[PDB]
Ligand SMILES: O=C1CC[C@H](N2C(=O)c3ccccc3C2=O)C(=O)N1
């Protein structure tokens with residue numbers, strides 16, 4: 001298409017470039033996974049094969065992982081520090097991916 005308006009995802013709080021709709025990843029047959037943490041917070045997580053502009057904090061943990069066989073690290077916006085989701089590693093097909101919180105991103109046109 002010409003002039004697509006739903007191409008890239010930016011940090012909602014600051015505008016840092018984070019990911020792309022083309023990089024959505026259907027984990028378990030769906031890119032969307034609705035999950036809760038031990039504090040009871042519900043997240044609509046979109047899985048992406050790739051992302052940029054984040055800062056991955058600390059070492060991986062398997063504790064409470066929403067995705068079998070993966071360990072996670074918190075992913076902050078590398079610009080403003082907003083908690084955007086998690087990076088998953090240590091698993092299989094794929095070894096790694098990102099789970100980002102949908103409502104913490106803004107979607108819009110490319111570049
Ligand atoms: O797959 C995941 C990613 C991390 C996530 N997580 C949280 O969001 C959290 C908040 C406070 C204490 C502990 C946790 C934790 O494990 C969680 O529960 N599962």
Ligand SMILES: [Zn+2]
Nearest residue numbers: 011014077080
């Ligand atoms: Zn940000």
